[PDB]
Each structure stands twice: as structure tokens, then as C-alpha cells.
Amino acid sequence: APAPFADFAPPVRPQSTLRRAITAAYRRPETECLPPLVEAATQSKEIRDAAASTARKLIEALRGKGVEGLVQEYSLSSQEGVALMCLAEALLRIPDTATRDALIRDKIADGNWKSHLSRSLFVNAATWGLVVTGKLTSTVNDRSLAAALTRLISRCGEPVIRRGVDMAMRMMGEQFVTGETIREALKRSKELEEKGFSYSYDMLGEAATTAADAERYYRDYESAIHAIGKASAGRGIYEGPGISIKLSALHPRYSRAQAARVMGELLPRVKALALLAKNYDIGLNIDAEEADRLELSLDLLEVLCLDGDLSGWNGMGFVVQAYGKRCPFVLDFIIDLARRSGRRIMVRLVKGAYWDAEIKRAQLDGLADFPVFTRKIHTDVSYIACAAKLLAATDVVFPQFATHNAQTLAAIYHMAGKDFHVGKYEFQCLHGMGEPLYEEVVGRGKLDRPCRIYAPVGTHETLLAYLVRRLLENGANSSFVHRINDPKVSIDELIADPVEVVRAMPVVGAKHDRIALPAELFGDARTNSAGLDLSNEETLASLTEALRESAAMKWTALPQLATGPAAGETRTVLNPGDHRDVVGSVTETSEEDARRAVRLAADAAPDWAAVPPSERAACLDRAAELMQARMPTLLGLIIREAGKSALNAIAEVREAIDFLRYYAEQTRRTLGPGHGPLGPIVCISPWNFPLAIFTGQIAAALVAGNPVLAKPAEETPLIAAEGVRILREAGIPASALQLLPGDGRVGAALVAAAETAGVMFTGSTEVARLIQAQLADRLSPAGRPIPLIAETGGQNAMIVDSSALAEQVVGDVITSAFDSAGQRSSALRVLCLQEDVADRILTMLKGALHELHIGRTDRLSVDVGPVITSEAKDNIEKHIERMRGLGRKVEQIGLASETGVGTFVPPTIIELEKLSDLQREVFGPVLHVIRYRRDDLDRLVDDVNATGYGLTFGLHTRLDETIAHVTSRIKAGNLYINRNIIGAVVGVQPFGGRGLSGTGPKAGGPLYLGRLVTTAPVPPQHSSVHTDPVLLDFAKWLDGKGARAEAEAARNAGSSSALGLDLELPGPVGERNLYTLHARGRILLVPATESGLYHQLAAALATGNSVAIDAASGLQASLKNLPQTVGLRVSWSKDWAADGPFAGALVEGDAERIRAVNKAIAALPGPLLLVQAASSGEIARNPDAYCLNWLVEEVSASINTAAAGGNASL
Ligand SMILES: Cc1cc2c(cc1C)N(C[C@H](O)[C@H](O)[C@H](O)COP(=O)(O)OP(=O)(O)OC[C@H]1O[C@@H](n3cnc4c(N)ncnc43)[C@H](O)[C@@H]1O)c1[nH]c(=O)[nH]c(=O)c1N2
Ligand SMILES: NC(=O)c1ccc[n+]([C@@H]2O[C@H](COP(=O)([O-])OP(=O)(O)OC[C@H]3O[C@@H](n4cnc5c(N)ncnc54)[C@H](O)[C@@H]3O)[C@@H](O)[C@H]2O)c1
Ligand SMILES: O=C(O)[C@@H]1CCC=N1
Ligand code: PRO
Ligand SMILES: [Mg+2]
């Protein structure tokens, strides 16, 4: 039985001094990086003057010599230009040239273009919008574009369509690519090869999602090498053409986590392509991609350069990105490698293409700093400093200076001096964009320096997958190509020397002022939790030791009563991935000691309530600091006790830290002397987020002034015990927080105890219903229901239309459905695929499924761990077999035999016919797939809502009309657009749903603390200027009936309601996170008096709800002659169970009436109802007898605004 963590993440090879220096610079502060770059990039005054002169001459040439022309000729608006190009694109998808021309002449030009063209004409409008306008919009206003296309055709007819088609054909066949196939691209290269250029061809493959895709990219590269080599005809690697490849195209799991697979499976494929390039003697360049693939790619480069089968050939090339903080250390490593191997490595120096994405990734991951510079001028200095390094080593490497910036060019041209020969170094540029500049460089009559054109090769479909990334660059306010076209920009500004500008700044190397470090994402509110970089070798080495150490500890969990540990029954705690791995020991709580603990908490409550809220929050902040410091050890316990992967365990500890700091800040913002605690609160938590959810409930209750009885899930008591220990170390007194391990019997004894003033439950809907029933028996000393927060299961869907990008969808589906083996309340359960793209996406999804590694989670390479118990396994596998027994297609990955020592379920895809085939939440790694026709979208949303759950929901579409439609009709608490659906970042995506998924309020949001005090505070930003209009009509009706006091109360409720609140929450770049208050639905009213009914109706209507009024009240005569607007919202119910589901209830009566009604409500089928009760006299005395916070519904929506391939705002 293998030792825990003994193979966690061993590096591919022992790290040399040169490799360790690369790693040390990964996230070095920007003020530390620049000074040595400024020193390295310094040149003489004479050189600087000469370079400015050269740059000035180049830039004057460029300024003194397409779509814009079309737009001008026909006076097109921007939307008209974009729609015309979308139309042209579609028409070109028609292959038969004369067939197309006829469709245009006889059908399109005579209007009704909708009539003739299961896929929006405008799916790529974001890209064409960049071409026409220079600005990137994440989503497509398809109704605007359809109106514009109708308008321009009705105005200008076939001629404008003809010009649109020809324009599109030219840009897509000749400007964005050198050719559609390698043979065509080579034909078109002859002309500029004559003029002294050379070429490197890029076959536009990247991001293989399946083994099939990788093998297809491999054979594309192989066939291109043959065509290029045959065309090269012996010209060699400097004069003749080469090829560029992306390693991500050649393997579907190209990542540090899968390093062993990369070296075993990807390396041989690159070697075979390199052997072919060697035979023809052409270049083969490895392109640079994301920052977390840099160091892994060095391991491939090293093996290849030391492989004797490749000796005698100097065509191997490697890209280095000067916007990266590691660039100079990467170059030292490469130059040394070229010395040891004897290979003259071709080094392409670029600035870097993924800047937007790197900023967002570091912010999302809570890392210490960015792996790239944040000021564009720093990249320019880095570039020039690294060019100086390369030019001093031309004996050993072949520098290739890829840039379109004339200032950069001129600086390097003069840096290189007067001695030149072909083969010493070259410049490089991108096809289409750089020929203007470099035609001022190449040739004996210019600067007589060679330039290699990077030449994309691909069909229209292929080009558009990543044409945005390639444009977005030349289009930002900071880009040279953009600035030289701006007339407001002078030549003097363009020939400005970045080295000298940086040197003379006050602070050399300061971070950009408008980009937040990950720790500062929330500004003064609170400190963001910090993560761990699992691509950093130093981090992996350190984490390996801490994880090993955490596994030698003798973890225990005991009943920790206010007076001290209690004895009880003791059993071991086993690793769910391997029951031979004993993780610890738990002593469970007796039912008598459970009851004892509640009495002890009651007696302690005044002492804890009297601790000022700000000192209570200081305890939470201290606890957050201790967990941050203990994160590596906590990680190791979560991995082995709960079966979680390291990545998921990091995110869990972050969430615990975030809960603690968020509820501390909310407390400091809100709580004062009049917000009295409820009293002892019982917190019952689930196994599957055994630290974060556990901590959030307890931290909220404590900071609100309540002593807590913490009852963790029976499966995961050890991490709960550690969280309690940390909370007590931080200053929470033993009497304020008692730990009671055990099963549901401990939970139920706690709920039933008379001094229990409130319950916070997270778990299954079934168990929540049992707790609701127990509590219907009970009232508070004041005669009011015991507050219950119950956050329960989900049946979460994602809808995907034909505009979505399949590779993005598959990544988000694999993550959402099979991360944590699907053991997240938010996990994706039903994937809904538009019929037109269903087969393609499903094929890709099954391919990606078979790349997942299932096993014990103490290895970094494991993607999917075990399920928590053999009972959970049996329940999940029974579901799979029923489905398989109804004829449903079932796809499963094969499990390795090593899984036999634990409880594993293989990730599973099930193809359903209708959504009605699923009855209950299946809490496991099981994805169901259904298909829909686009016209039935609205019915599909109904089917999703019809399950009665309402937790998470995803939508993948580029089309605004679809977004508006679906998000206005779906009923769920957490929405996600063009991303995964498992985001629950505290204070950013406040988490929690409706219906069968919860009562609210949401955890990690601003209404949560108010449920745990007797008088609710006003949350930050909690108000609305909007007044419900049916409420206003009802207040007027009351005035007409003579109920003047109730009329005024109604108008007051109208004003106090926060319905219509609509906020954007601060978060990472490249995302919009929105928070809104909606109506809950239909509220059950159980009045006793006429005035009580009017107050209840006012509260419900003020918050946007409809109502069902208890007919047994006998108060029908009190609502004669209602305005139709109000009557539409009102119904009367004899049989409550028949008229649901309800979303809440308002009750009037004395204590025995409230208790009776409460039992009746708890017996209603379906969701748990948040009930509010008041006596007639309380309604008279207290205008907040019915609190409006609990009559609205919170909705969180997280939109990935980077999904179109770039970040506009950045
Ligand atoms: C032949 C060839 C081959 C390649 C590439 C280019 C060329 C010409 N690229 C793309 C390259 O990284 C770069 O994005 C473009 O060439 C534009 O940079 P220029 O120097 O031409 O212009 P320019 O001087 O305008 O520099 C713009 C660049 O500055 C950087 N930048 C912008 N804002 C910034 C900020 N706030 N802070 C820091 N830096 C900022 C970015 O790197 C951006 O591309 C690349 N890229 C890649 O990553 N891998 C590869 O393999 C290649 N391959
Ligand atoms: N909505 C959310 O925020 C959220 C988050 C995590 C998990 N969940 C849900 O939790 C479920 C999985 O967790 P679980 O298996 O640990 O849940 P569960 O319902 O099995 O058990 C949850 C807790 O209730 C206790 N319990 C069991 N019976 C009880 C009873 N009769 N009286 C009082 N307490 C009792 C258990 O000891 C445990 O602490 C899933 O349905 C999941 O969707 C929801
Ligand atoms: O594909 C890209 O964006 C960059 C430019 C050429 C190679 N890599
Ligand atoms: O992916 C694309 O379309 C761009 C075009 C040049 C290289 N990459
Ligand atoms: Mg259970």
C-alpha cells in the first residue's frame, strides 16, 4: 500500500541551477524585474540618436503608403458593415460559385434573407466587429445585426452584397491566411521570397481536446513538413521555409499536472516531426503559449536537443516571450543548452500573445503576482534587454526578432552593429500585417536585413477560431500597429525610447495603477485569500513535504463541550480512495451530551453576545490568518479524508478563508447593539465541502453573537475538528463553539433541544425536510418559528446553442460535471445540446472523458477522485444501471484495478430522451445529455424549471437575444454565461438557490447575517428606487375603501422593499458578476384579521410576489372590487397542497395558531417554505412584523466576458 504523497508531483528531471533561476523569477515583483533589464538594454547616446533616426524614416515610409472603403462607398453604419460581412461569410460557406451567385441574385437580394440562411448568420460577429470597428464585444446583438442587414439590402440590393462577398473572400483567403492549404500558401510565397523574404508556416492547430484531435493535428503537421521540405528543395534553414507548431495541438493533456504523459506520449510525436524536418533540412519552431506551459516545454526542448538521432540539424527553434518575467533566465538556459548540445537553437523573441488571459488567471487563482509585466513599456524594455543578450551569443544561437514595432526594430538593428551575414540573425513578421514595414527593411537598397513571414494556413472555419487573439493585439490603444494609424499620435511619440522613459520614472517598474494584484481584488473591504501555483516547481517541492508531514499526524475529532472533551464511541476514519490508509480517529457524541451541550451554550450566550461585534469579527479575521498559514497541512487532510484533488482542496481552504473575512467585514459594516442574537444555533454541515461550508455557517452564527453547536458530517469529522481548533486558537471561547461529531442522530438531538434558537443546515433536501418537520413542533419563547436556513440539492442544467464554441463547452462541461467526482451541489447534471451541434459536441465530450485520470488523489496527476462511501457508490451505480436498463446509451471510462481498495465510480455520460427521465439529484460523476430543436428552447427552459430545483444553471451562447430570453425565464439562484457552473466565490457569486434547492438567504452574500439576529440590520448597498406597481394599485384601493392607515403602511412597504436592486460585485477582470433581487413567487398568506390580511398583502406585493390566501380565514369579503392588476396577483386557496408550490408564507395569529399553521405548512409537498409569523398585536405595533428581506429572491449571475477570445476593457 503506497505511502501517502510519496509520488505527489516529482519533477521531470532534477532542476539545474539555471532551471531553478527560471522558477525563482516566475512571479517576482515588477519593481525587482526592471532595473537589470534597464541596465542590459542601455545603449550609447550615439546609438540612440541613430536608432531614432532610423525609426523615424521607417515610420514616415509606413504613413506615406479595405473594409473601410466598402463602408464609405455605401455609407454603412458599423452594424451594417458587420452584418454584411457575416452575410458574406455565410454565402462563401456555399461551395458552388454559380450556385451562390444565383441565390444572391434571385433570393437574397429580393429581401427575405432569413428565409434562406439552424445557425445564426452572426455567430462570428464579434470577430467581424473587430475588423469593422476595432472594438471587441463579447456577445453579439443579433437582433440589431438582423435589422441592419435587412436595412442595407433593402437600400442597396445585389451590388452591396457582391462587394461584401468579394471583400470577405479576399480577407479570408488572402489576408488572414497565406492560403487555405499548404500547397496554395507555398504557391503564394514565391513572390516575396524573390524579394528576399522567407516563410514559416503555421497550420493553425491548437488546444487538442481529444486523442483524435491530436492525431489529426499531427498528420496535418507531417503533411505540411513534406510539402514545405519538397518546396524548400535544399535551400536550408536560413534561406528556406520552415514550420511552426504548438505543443498543445499534439496532446490533449499538455500540462504540468500530466507531465509524465507529456514526456511519454507527446515527446515522441515531436521527435518524429523533427526527424522529418531534419531530413528536408527545414526549420521547426515550437511556439510559446500560456505561462504555465513555459517550463514544461523546456523539458521537451532539452530532451530533443540532446537526442543523437537529431544531430547534424540546426533547424530546431523555440519561442521566448519578453512580456514574461522569466524571459532572461529562460534565455540563459537555452543559450547554455545550445552550448552543451552543440545545436544552434533558433530563438524567436516575441513580446507575447496571451496577456489578457494571464492577468485574469492570476487574479482567479489568488497568486502572489503576475507572470507577465503589467505596463506595456516594461515588455518593450524586456524585449530590448533580451535582444542584447541574444546578440552577444550569435555564435551559439540564431536570434529571430519577431516584431512590428519600428522603434524596437531600429533599436536592435543598431545594437547588432555593422557586421552582418545571412545566418547571423533575422527579423520576423506576421503575414498581412508586417510586409509594409519590412519592405522598408529587406533588400540591398533598404537596410539589407532578412525577414521571415509567419504564414497562417487554414480554411475559413480554422482561421476564425483564434483570429481575435491575433487582431486584439493590433487594436489596443497601446499597440504600435494601432498607434501608427492614429493621427493624434506623432512620430516623436512613436520613436520614444522606452528604456529611457522607464529609467526616469519615480518608481522604476511600478505595477500598472489600474490592475489589481490578486490579493487586492476587493480593495479596502477585505484581503483576498491566496492560492498556490501547482505549476511552480518550488511550490510543488514544498507542498510535497508538507503533505507527507500532514499524513504522519494522528488527527482526531472529539466531542468538545464547553467543559472539556467528552468520552464516547471511537472509530477510525478511512481514506475513501484507499481504505488501508487510516487518516485518523473520531469519538462520536452521545445524545445525552448533545443535549448537555445546548444547555451549556444557552448558559454561555450572554457572555458571548456581550463581546462587541468588532471583537467578534477580529476573531474571524485571526482565524482566517491561521488557516492561510496552515493551508498546506489542511490541504493534505482534505485530500485524504474527503477524497479531493489538490486543486479542489486549495479552492476549499480559500473559500473558508473568504467566508471568515467576508462575514467579519459584513459584521463591521452592519451590526450594532440593537441587533440581538437569536441564541444557541445548531450548524449541521455536509461531507463534501467539509471545511468551507462548515466554517461559513459557524463563522456567520458566531459573529452575529450566537453560541454555536457544530455538528459536522459523519464522514469528515477530522477537518471539522481542526477548523474548530483554529477558531478557538483565534479567540472564540470554548463555550461559544462546541464540536459534536456524530451521525444524524446527533444532528436531530441538537435540533430538538428546547434552547436551540436557530438551525443552519446544508445537506440533502430529504434530510432538510425531516428537520423542517421537527421544527414545526417548536416555537421560540416569544411565540415565533425557529429560524431555519436550509441549503439543499440541485438538478443543474447547461444549455448550449449552435453559436457556442465546442472546445470551450467541453472544457466547462468536463469541469462542471466530473470535478470532485460530481460531488458538488452545483455540479452539472443535465447538458442540453441544440440538435444541429449535438453529435459533434458529444463526440468531443466522450473523447475528453477518456483523457481523465481516476484514482487516489494524493497524486497531482489525478483528475477525479473517489466517491465518499460505498453507500454513495451503490446508490450512484444503481441509477446508472436503471438508465442502462431502459436502453439509454451509457459511456464510462475504465477504472484501473488500483481503485479496488477504495470507493470509485467512473465518470459517466448518459444520453436521455427527455428531462422527465430524471427524478432526483444523483450526487456523483454522472452527466445526462439531452438534445433540443432551437424552436423548442422556451419549452426546454420550462422543463428545467419543472424539476422544482433551482441552484445553478449555465448558458453557452454568443447571441444576446438568446441570453435575454433564457436568463429571463430560468428560475435559479446562480447563473453562469460562457463559463463553468461551479463558481461560488464568496462575495462575488453569493451562492444558493430556490425551490427544492434552498430557503435562502445565500451564503457568502449580504443578507446572510441578518437571518441570525432578532432584528435585521440594513445590508450594505441594500435598497431600490423601484416601487412595485401592483403594490401602488393596492395602496390606492385601500385608500378608496377607507383603510387609510393600511394604505400608508402599503406605501411604506413599497419604499422599503429592495425589489429591483441590481448590483455589480467587484471581482476579477474578464468577468462581470451581478447580484439582483427578484420576487420569490407565490406567497401563502394565512391571515386572521382584515388588517392583518392587508399588511400581509402589502408586504408580498411590495416585493413583487403573487399570493394564495387561506380561504378558511373567512376574509373574502375584505377584498371586494380589487383592481384587475391586483386581482391578477391574488387567488384564494381551500387546499394549500394543491395550489403550490409556494415560495414563502406569512401567518397571523396567537402562538397556538402559529404552531398549528406551521405544522400544516411543513406538511405541504415540495420545497421548504420560509415562514414568517406575527400576532395581530405585533402587526399593529411593528411595521416590520413581516420582514421584506425574506420576501425577495437573490440571483447571482457570472458572465465570462473574455469568452470571445479577448478582454475589451484591458
Ligand atoms: C513571427 C511572429 C511569431 C509570433 C508572434 C509574433 C510574430 C511577429 N507572437 C505574437 C507577439 O507575441 C506579439 O503579440 C505581436 O507580435 C505584437 O507585438 P509587436 O512587438 O509587434 O507590437 P507592440 O510593440 O505594439 O507590442 C504589443 C505587445 O505588448 C505587450 N503588452 C500590451 N499591453 C501590455 C501591458 N499592459 N503590460 C505588458 N505587456 C503588454 C503584449 O505582448 C502585446 O502583444 C507570438 N506570441 C506568443 O505568445 N507566442 C508565439 O509563439 C508567438 N509567435
Ligand atoms: N445548496 C448548497 O449550498 C449545498 C452545498 C453542499 C452540499 N449540498 C447538498 O448536500 C448533499 C450532500 O451532503 P451530505 O450527503 O453530507 O448530506 P446529508 O443530507 O446526507 O447529510 C447532511 C448533514 O445532516 C446530518 N443529518 C442526517 N440526517 C439527519 C437528521 N435526521 N437530522 C438532523 N441532521 C441529520 C448529517 O449528519 C450531516 O451532517 C447533497 O444533496 C448536496 O447537494 C448543498
Ligand atoms: O498564435 C498566436 O497568437 C501567436 C502568433 C504566432 C504564433 N503564436
Ligand atoms: O489563429 C489565428 O487566426 C492567428 C492568425 C495569425 C496566427 N494566429
Ligand atoms: Mg448522508
Author numbering: 14 to 78, 83 to 134, 137 to 1229
How did the manuscript describe this experimental structure?
The bifunctional enzyme proline utilization A (PutA) catalyzes the two-step oxidation of L-proline to L-glutamate using proline dehydrogenase (PRODH) and L-glutamate-γ-semialdehyde dehydrogenase (GSALDH) domains. The two active sites are 42 Å apart and connected by a buried tunnel that is hypothesized to channel the intermediates Δ1-pyrroline-5-carboxylate (P5C) and/or L-glutamate-γ-semialdehyde (GSAL). The PRODH active site is located in a (βα)8 barrel, while the GSALDH module features Rossmann NAD+-binding and catalytic domains, which are both characteristic of the ALDH superfamily. Kinetic and conventional X-ray crystallography of PutA from Sinorhizobium meliloti (SmPutA) were used to capture high resolution (1.47–1.88 Å) structures of states along the catalytic cycle, including a novel FADH−-proline covalent adduct in the PRODH site, the intermediate P5C bound noncovalently in the reduced PRODH active site, the covalent acyl-enzyme intermediate of the GSALDH reaction, and noncovalent complexes of GSAL and the final product L-glutamate in the GSALDH active site.
Catalytic cycling of the PRODH reaction was performed in crystallo by soaking crystals of the C844S variant of SmPutA in 40 mM L-proline, 1 mM Coenzyme Q1, and 1 mM NAD+. Surprisingly, the structure determined after 24 h of catalytic cycling (1.88 Å resolution) showed strong electron density evidence for a species covalently bound to the N5 of the FAD. Based on a recent quantum mechanics-molecular mechanics study of the PRODH reaction, we have modeled this species as L-proline bonded to reduced FAD. The covalent adduct links the N5 of the FAD to C5 of L-proline. The N5-C5 bond length refined to 1.66 Å, which is rather long for an N-C bond but consistent with the aforementioned quantum mechanics-molecular mechanics study. The FAD exhibits strong butterfly bending of the isoalloxazine with a bend angle of ∼20° (si face convex). Altogether, the active site in the adduct structure is partially disassembled compared to the Michaelis complex. As noted in the previous section, the covalent FADH−-proline adduct was modeled only in chain B. In chain A, electron density for the adduct was weak; however, two electron density features consistent with either proline or P5C bound noncovalently in the PRODH active site were observed. One of these features is consistent with a proline-like molecule bound noncovalently next to the si-face of the reduced FAD and was interpreted as representing a newly produced P5C molecule (occupancy of 0.73). The other site appears to be a heretofore uncharacterized secondary binding site and was interpreted as either proline entering the active site or P5C leaving (occupancy of 0.87).
